C-alpha cells in the first residue's frame, strides 16, 4: 500500500521526530552530530546529521526541538518535539479556536498550537532560510510527533510560498483547526503534508470534531500493532476530509498506540 521509498521516508522522519524527545538534542552545539539514546534514531545517525539550531522551552508553548542538516539525504529538517509528558498534556488540552486569516481565509487554528508557533516563527523561519540559501538544493522537511506534529503542520502552512517547498511529516498529530483549514492543508502547493496515524491512537482523535475541528486529507494509517515492526504493506492511504476508515473510528482509543510509530517515539529522555 505505500511504496518502499515513501515508507523509507515515513521511517526516517519518525526517527527525526523521536530524536526531538532526547533531552541532549534540545541544547546541543551547532555543528555537533545528532544522536539518540536507547537506539531510537539509527537512521538519523547513519546520515551526516548535524545540528543547525537547537531549542528548548522557547516562546509561549515551550517549543522544543531542533533544526538539522543532513548531508547524506540532502535535507534541512526542522523537528518539533511533542510534550515532555504526553499523558498530562492530553488531559489538560484546551480546545479553543482562534481565527488565522493570516494563513487562510475563514480558517481557524487551535489557539494554543497557532500561538506557540507564532512565538518562535520569526526566529525559526530565519534559521530555515539561512540553510536554504546555504544549501539551495536540499529539501525543507518539517516534522514532529504528537504536539510537535501540530507545530510542524501549522509551521508548514505559514512558511510555504516563499521560494522553497516544505514537506510536513506528522506522527500522531491532533487536529489543528476547522474545516476551512483542513481543506487548506489538503490542497496547498509548495509541499506535501504526510499526516501519519497509528491504529487507535487517541491523539489524532482530539480535539473532538464536536469542538469545531477537522482533519486534513489524506491520512497514512498504520494498521500494524503497538510494538510490532511496520512494513510497507501495513500503511493504507485514506482519502477524504474527516475520513472514517483509518484512525477516526468509533471505538475506544489507547495511549500506548500513540508511542509506537515505526519504533518507540515520545519516550527518549
Swiss-Prot record:
Keywords: Cleavage on pair of basic residues, Disulfide bond, Hydrolase, Lipid degradation, Lipid metabolism, Signal, Zymogen. It is an enzyme of class 3 (hydrolase). Pfam families: Lipase3_N, Lipase_3. Transmembrane segments: none annotated. The active site is at residues 146, 201, 258. Belongs to the AB hydrolase superfamily. Lipase family. This is Lipase. It comes from Thermomyces lanuginosus.
Amino acid at each position: 500500500e505505500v511504496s518502499q521509498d515513501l515508507f523509507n521516508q515515513f521511517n526516517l522522519f519518525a526517527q527525526y521526530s523521536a530524536a526531538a524527545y532526547c533531552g541532549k538534542n534540545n541544547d546541543a552545539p551547532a555543528g555537533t552530530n545528532i544522536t539518540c539514546t536507547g537506539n531510537a534514531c539509527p537512521e538519523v545517525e547513519k546520515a551526516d546529521a548535524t545540528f543547525l539550531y537547537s531549542f528548548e522551552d522557547s516562546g509561549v508553548g515551550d517549543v522544543t526541538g531542533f533544526l538539522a542538516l543532513d548531508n547524506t539525504n540532502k535535507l534541512i529538517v526542522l523537528s518539533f518535539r511533542g510534550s515532555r509528558s504526553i499523558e498530562n498534556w492530553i488531559g489538560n488540552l484546551n480546545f479553543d479556536l482562534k481565527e488565522i486569516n493570516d494563513i487562510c481565509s475563514g480558517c481557524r487554528g487551535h489557539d494554543g498550537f497557532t500561538s506557540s508557533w507564532r512565538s518562535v516563527a520569526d526566529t525559526l523561519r530565519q534559521k530555515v532560510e539561512d540553510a536554504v540559501r546555504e544549501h539551495p538544493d536540499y529539501r525543507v522537511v518539517f516534522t514532529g510527533h504528537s504536539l510537535g506534529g501540530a507545530l510542524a503542520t501549522v509551521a508548514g502552512a505559514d512558511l510555504r510560498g516563499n521560494g522553497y517547498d516544505i514537506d510536513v511529516f506528522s506522527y500522531g498529530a491532533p487536529r489543528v483547526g476547522n474545516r476551512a483549514f483542513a481543506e487548506f492543508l489538503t490542497v496547498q502547493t509548495g509541499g506535501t503534508l504526510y499526516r501519519i496515524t497509528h491504529t487507535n491512537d487517541i491523539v489524532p482523535r482530539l480535539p473532538p470534531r464536536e469542538f469545531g475541528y477537522s482533519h486534513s486529507s489524506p491520512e497514512y494509517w498504520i494498521k500494524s500493532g503497538t510494538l510490532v515492526p511496520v512494513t510497507r504493506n501495513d500503511i493504507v492511504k485514506i482519502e477524504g476530509i474527516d475520513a472514517t476508515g483509518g484512525n477516526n473510528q468509533p471505538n475506544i482509543p489507547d495511549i500506548p498506540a500513540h508511542l509506537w510509530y515505526f519504533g518507540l517515539i515520545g519516550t527518549c529522555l
